[PDB]
Structure 1
């Protein structure tokens, strides 16, 4: 029985072309270029999903450092004091507190200062 290849190819062509909407130039019209761009786009998405956590952590660290320096304390000393004090709030909510509730961040800075050792450079 002779079989025509229309439907089987048209299915995947429709899916690939629909997935490539919004692209510029040939990448949104022609199936081959759209498929190449789909490969690249999905690889980029997979890599960026992994890198997004680090990107957001870097942004939170920047905001926390800015807020802490506004309270006359460095980010690293503040983190060490917070770890010593036992407060387990992560950097995401720390940055949220810094942006939204400066009083809570000031209180946390105070408790971190309290928890820090007397001479940070001592061999202890």
Structure 2
């Protein structure tokens, strides 16, 4: 469900998880899925947070 929601929001599930972690969120995938099916607006906000926390370059060796 999370992958579906992320793709509908134009992002891949793995990137959503990576950005979410890099932002240091502590919510788990059960709540992720329940939100994604309950409040698309909140899911959108969360994905923006993840994208913003996503570094500039993803291929950096560092």
TM bin, normalised by shorter chain, reads over 0.9
2:8 corresponds to 1:70: yes
Q: Which residue among 15, 34, 41 is the counterpart of 1:96?
A: 34
Unaligned runs of 5+ in 1: 1-62
1:50-80, CA deviations, whole angstroms, 9 ceiling, x for partnerless residues? xxxxxxxxxxxxx000000001100001100
TM-score normalised per structure 1:
0.49
Q: How well do the aligned residues superpose, as a CA RMSD in angstroms? A: 0.6
Which structure's CA Rg is the greater one?
Answer: 1
SS for the counterpart of 2:60 is coil
TM-score normalised per structure 2:
0.96
Find runs of 4+ consecutive structure 1 residues off by over 2 angstroms: none
Query: d(CA) in 2 for partners of 1:73 and 1:64?
Result: 11
- Structure having greater relative contact order (Cα 8 Å, sep ≥ 6): 2
Aligned residue pairs total 62
Query: d(CA) in 2 for partners of 1:75 and 1:120?
Result: 15
